[PDB]
Amino acid sequence: ATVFKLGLFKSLFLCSFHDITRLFKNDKTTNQQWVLAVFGLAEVFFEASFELLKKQCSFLQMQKRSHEGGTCAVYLICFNTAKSRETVRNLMANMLNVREECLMLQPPKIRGLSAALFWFKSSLSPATLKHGALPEWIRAQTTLN
Amino acid sequence: ATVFKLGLFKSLFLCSFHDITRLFKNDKTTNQQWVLAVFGLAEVFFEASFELLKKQCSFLQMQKRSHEGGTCAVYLICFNTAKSRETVRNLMANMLNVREECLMLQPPKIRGLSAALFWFKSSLSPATLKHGALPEWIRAQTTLN
DNA sequence: ATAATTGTTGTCAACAATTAT
DNA sequence: ATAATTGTTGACAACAATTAT
Secondary structure, three states: OHHHHHHHHHHHHOOOHHHHEOOOOOOOOOOOEEEEEEEOOOHHHHHHHHHHHHHOEEEEEEEEEEEOOEEEEEEEEEEOOOOOHHHHHHHHHHHHHOOHHHEEEEOEOOOOHHHHHHHHHHHHOOOOEEEEOOOHHHHHHOOOO | OOHHHHHHHHHHHOOOHHHHEOOOOOOOOOOOEEEEEEEOOOHHHHHHHHHHHHHOEEEEEEEEEEEOOEEEEEEEEEEOOOOOHHHHHHHHHHHHHOOHHHEEEEOEOOOOHHHHHHHHHHHHOOOOEEEEOOOHHHHHHOOOO
């Protein structure tokens, strides 16, 4: 089913989930920055999650799209504390009120222009929910040096 | 807890918070049924909390009112598991996204007509959010024997 | 350098037990 | 009987360490 996942994502955000995330084959690997793809998220919970994550984050950007084929949302989170996938997998699964089977968690692709812009383009749209100062790896890759 | 909380509560629900709760002077005392009074609760979180509590409850009834002096909501929760006040105090404080200083947690007054009806009257209003079968101590005290 | 792996510690919910009102 | 008190156990997040790519 993971196949129908990525396909749906790319379909809504016009770019492969991979083009914005590096791999972490171990759910125990800890890290602060995480990219989250959610499916079937309820509007209310989306709004809610925002406020709750602000408390424990340095930066946070949320976007949500949908259509007659299914809904989805993306999260760029910078937890004040390093969290393993399990840790996050648990925290969010509950916070968003969705089964784990509806979550894709991979660290961001901090080294890549294509990616770095995806976050910028979003930070432009008003629909997007932002909080905190843009991560360094993002501002740098998107500014005339 | 504080003058404000009560005075405001009684003001909105037309009855002293005491008339529907028995005392528990120890935050460690465990129990399944809890009455919760919240203040400054955000609409979104109210709606959210509902769905999240259903997962871990046998029964649940939520009501919310307000006015140009303050807002307030009441919760009658029947956790599938016995929880100390601390436990609940923590769970909700976060779930509702409000500081503990904005919560009054006392077990329900399972023996008292005046009280038993408060829950019934509410279960009548459509505005109220209900889930599960009415607690025994409630149906019994509100039915022609 | 990056992250897969393994292990240690602190916090807290689930829960047993014992005393006191 | 009810609940104030104290204590035990299990799950898990925060975090140190060590190996492997």
